[PDB]
A paper describes a structure:
Like the eukaryotic PRORPs, HARPs are members of the PIN domain superfamily, but belong to a different subgroup (PIN_5 cluster). Like Aq_880 from A. aeolicus, in vitro cleavage assays showed that PbHARP, TcHARP, TmHARP and TrHARP can all remove the 5’-end of pre-[name], suggesting that pre-[name] 5’-end processing is one conserved activity of HARP.
No crystal grew for Aq_880, TmHARP or TrHARP, but we successfully solved the apo-form structures of PbHARP and TcHARP at atomic resolution. TcHARP crystal belongs to P212121 space group and there is only one TcHARP dimer in the asymmetric unit. Both PbHARP and TcHARP are of α/β fold in nature; they share six β-strands (β1-β6) and ten α-helices (α1-α10). The dimerization manner of TcHARP is similar to that of PbHARP. However, structural analysis revealed some conformational differences between the PbHARP and TcHARP dimers, especially in the HB regions. Further analysis showed that the overall folds of the two TcHARP monomers are similar to that of PbHARP monomer A (or C), the conformational differences are mainly caused by the bending of α8 of PbHARP monomer B (or D), hinged at residue E147. The root-mean-square deviation (RMSD) value between TcHARP and PbHARP A or C monomers is 1.0 Å, whereas is 1.4 Å between TcHARP and PbHARP B or D monomers. At higher concentration of salt (200–500 mM), it exists as dimer; however, it assembles into larger oligomers in buffer containing 100 mM salt. The apo-form structures of PbHARP and TcHARP are also in an inactive form.
Numbering used by the authors:
A (entry chain A): 1 to 197
B (entry chain B): 1 to 192
The structure:
């Protein structure tokens, strides 16, 4: 049994809280389950996803588990074929993520700026935040593709709280589970396989 | 012989001028060649590309040719498989198209915003121009994929002046020609 993990159960405050009060504690709780399933169940992340979660998590404090129990593996691309509609999936993902980023970038400017600020100061704040929304929207959509393609090739279950990802997985015939229910699934996997829970 | 046409030879002033002084004139000149090659050479556009060209071209003033000699055909997507690296090509294309838009949005904001605008007005000018850059960057990248996939399925030659599209065609082993030389290519086909 193989799982491909999105950032959700570690970095999304409304789902990672089922595992811990911080990303580091959430990861620690996850790794305790992953350790108890070592050799029976494998957990994968594309490298770009892993780099995002460990921006928030204390990697040094979670050795050896953080390196042994999460497999960092980019999907294979050479000689691999995918449905053509995947391109439309990626396009909607980019538009979905960028539109949200623009709102976030706008709301961020409207909290920092005061009516007395000059024109150039206002423009540089919006341009900076808009540029960040675009670049993050693009990388994250590519990372979404990596997750999908990795789980497809591994015949693994995707673990995410992102509705767009789960619908995309569904359409491609990829197994998935809602990340909000992942701890429940992990608890049931330990009980099905033995050992202290 | 089959050709898949980008907007270039109709809407890009630096390329269509080789066919006519306006998009309508360019289309008229092109249809002149396309009519005389009817039955020998077929010309295709994805529907989204066609709608873009005829926003600038008076479709009414060019009947019957504009309807007979250009085949509007979306690529097939159902049950179609593509190489996975196409998605990476599309990602680079999106970034390329968005980057171009940012320059357009940049100059447009720079001219539109004035010292007197309140905070709401500056934000609305910036948001409006950036959203338009994003929207067009997204549509153009999807149309670029439609062009690419169409030419793939037809084994047709892409006709474009867009560096992104030609590089994408090259990587995928799709025939292409620089649209700046298309009239010259058409002239040589007609003499045949």
């Amino acid at each position: 049994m193989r799982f491909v993990l999105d950032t959700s159960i570690f970095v999304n405050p409304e789902v990672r809280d089922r595992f811990g009060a911080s990303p580091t504690e959430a990861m620690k709780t996850f790794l305790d389950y992953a350790g108890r399933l070592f050799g029976r169940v494998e957990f994968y992340m594309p490298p770009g996803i892993y780099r995002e979660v460990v921006h928030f998590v204390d990697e040094e404090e979670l050795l050896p588990g953080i390196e042994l129990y999460i497999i960092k593996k980019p999907p294979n691309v050479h000689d691999i074929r995918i449905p053509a509609f995947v391109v439309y999936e990626l396009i909607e993902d980019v538009r979905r993520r960028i539109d949200k980023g623009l709102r976030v970038a706008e709301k961020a400017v409207r909290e920092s700026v005061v009516e007395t600020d000059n024109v150039d100061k206002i423009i540089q704040k919006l341009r900076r935040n808009y540029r960040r929304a675009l670049r993050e929207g693009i990388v994250d959509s590519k990372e979404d593709f990596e997750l999908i393609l990795l789980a497809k090739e591994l015949d693994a279950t995707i673990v995410s709280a992102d509705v767009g990802i789960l619908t995309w997985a569904q359409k491609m015939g990829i197994k998935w589970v809602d990340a909000a229910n992942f701890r429940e699934l992990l608890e049931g996997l330990v009980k099905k396989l033995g050992g202290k829970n």
